């Protein structure tokens, strides 16, 4: 038994080691699979198939550098998927031919959320795959070691952040008062964020959002927003700086502000936009 690589670099009858150089998908998003198909580069044959039968296993697979830190995933060996890094030696595959057939191993890797930029650096070691070969003749137990080196950078584009707003907020008072508006943002990859408000405004200053209740409406009252006391007019970008893993509060308060003639009891309902602007 022996094997070689599509670059025609061999590992002979006793087992031994070799490098395999894989060209990867150059861009992989957080939800997608980065497939590293080793069955198109690693090929084996049995040397005496009319008498001896060869047994081949994925003895172990280990992940290195950017595959170990930024990816999760599996290894498909001959039709079955196991965890990768692997937790144990797979079942046998039989090699019973002198003609080179593939070793059917593929890595299915998904970038996690914390991965960013360059999740696999060009030229670096991605994985070590041990092919174990035994037989029905002697007690020969050989290890074929395949060192998988990435030829190029694998980039995991950063995603937009998550704006977690606990409710669709009751501003009651029907009074007369003010209320915090739970609104926090977090990014998997630290980036600068800005936000601006938008909607129908009633005032020259353009910070008092109209009442739009359409079921026994109040009158004379609008709704204004405040970030720790500071009024936020519509279309005025507020700078949050760098927002990372830790949720940054926007520190919003809803308040009632007057818009005109007699203030009248009733329902006060407004809908405002909040546009987060990416750098």
């Amino acid at each position: 038994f022996a094997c070689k690589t599509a670059n025609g670099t061999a590992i002979p009858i006793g087992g031994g080691s070799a490098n395999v150089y894989v060209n990867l998908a150059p861009v992989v998003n957080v939800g997608q699979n980065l497939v590293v198909d080793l069955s198109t580069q690693i090929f084996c044959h049995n040397d005496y198939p009319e008498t001896i039968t060869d047994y081949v296993t994925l003895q172990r697979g280990s992940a290195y550098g950017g595959v170990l830190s930024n990816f999760s995933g599996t290894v498909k060996y001959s039709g079955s998927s196991y965890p990768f890094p692997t937790t144990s030696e797979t079942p046998r595959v039989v090699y019973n031919s002198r003609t080179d057939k593939p070793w059917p191993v593929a890595l299915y890797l998904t970038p996690v959320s914390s991965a960013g930029g360059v999740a696999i650096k060009a030229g670096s070691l991605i994985a070590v795959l041990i092919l174990r070969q035994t037989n029905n003749y002697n007690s020969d137990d050989f290890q074929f070691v395949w060192n998988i080196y990435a030829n190029n950078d694998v980039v995991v584009p950063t995603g937009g952040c998550d704006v977690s707003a606990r409710d669709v907020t009751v501003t009651l008072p029907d009074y007369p008062g003010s209320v915090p508006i739970p609104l926090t943002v977090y990014c998997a990859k630290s980036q600068n964020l800005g936000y601006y408000l938008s909607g129908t405004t009633a005032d020259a200053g353009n910070s008092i959002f109209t009442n739009t209740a359409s079921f026994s409406p109040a009158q004379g009252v609008g709704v204004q927003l405040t970030r720790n006391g500071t009024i936020i007019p519509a279309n005025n970008t507020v700078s949050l700086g760098a927002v990372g893993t830790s949720a940054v509060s926007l520190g919003l308060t809803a308040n009632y502000a007057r818009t005109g003639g007699q203030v009248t009891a009733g329902n006060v309902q407004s809908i405002i936009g909040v546009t987060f602007v990416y750098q």
């Binding site: 960013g116 704006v163 009751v170 508006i181 609104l183 329902n267």
Partner: protein
């Protein structure tokens, strides 16, 4: 809430559609997603249009937005053009609270959208370094000779932290103002390598 799977969109001229992922995380919230693109001036042009123009995302869900080129090949072909893509998540009418006082927040994400003509001679990655500077004693002016928009960020003049900045194709920007350092954000949203502020 709802979040986009990128912080920017590169639209390569020629392609009939660029894809953008959106994802709703809130297991028990339903949102109507509406999306549109504006030009550099804020006008809702019809230059680009978004695919499905209006759909629901109920509970944890993943959807694809398709940005179609509606330009009629009327855009400059030797440099990028800056547009803004907005994806808005209209929360459902909460019937419970009809008779109370309420504030609804519609969260929108707004990201750069660069239309990129197909035959630019210098490549996207050889762009950042090609920047140069011209000093004054009031200001620092950035000269971007390349055909790509440059997101200049981490602009350092010695000890001093200057305005982050957006420098257009074959044009320039100016910031209030030693050794100049600066990074740029690339097509992937990642910070390029800290670079040395070379003069003009």
């Amino acid at each position: 809430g709802v979040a986009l799977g990128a912080t920017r969109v590169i639209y390569p001229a020629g392609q009939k559609q660029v894809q953008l992922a959106v994802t709703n995380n809130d297991e028990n919230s339903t949102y109507l997603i509406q999306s549109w693109v504006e030009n550099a001036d804020g006008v809702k042009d019809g230059r680009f249009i978004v695919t499905p123009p209006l759909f629901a995302m109920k509970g944890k869900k993943e959807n694809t937005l398709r940005i179609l080129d509606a330009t009629n090949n009327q855009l400059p072909q030797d440099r990028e053009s800056l547009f803004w893509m907005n994806v808005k998540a209209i929360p459902s009418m909460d019937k419970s609270k009809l008779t109370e006082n309420t504030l609804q927040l519609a969260i929108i994400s707004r990201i750069k959208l660069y239309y990129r003509p197909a035959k630019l001679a210098l490549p996207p990655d050889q762009a950042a370094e090609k920047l140069r500077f011209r000093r004054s004693a009031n200001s620092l002016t950035l000269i971007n000779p390349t055909p790509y928009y440059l997101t200049v960020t981490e602009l350092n003049a010695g000890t001093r932290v200057l305005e982050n900045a957006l420098v257009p194709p074959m044009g320039e920007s100016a910031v209030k103002l030693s050794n100049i350092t600066y990074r740029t954000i690339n097509d992937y949203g990642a910070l390029t390598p800290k670079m040395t502020g070379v003069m003009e």
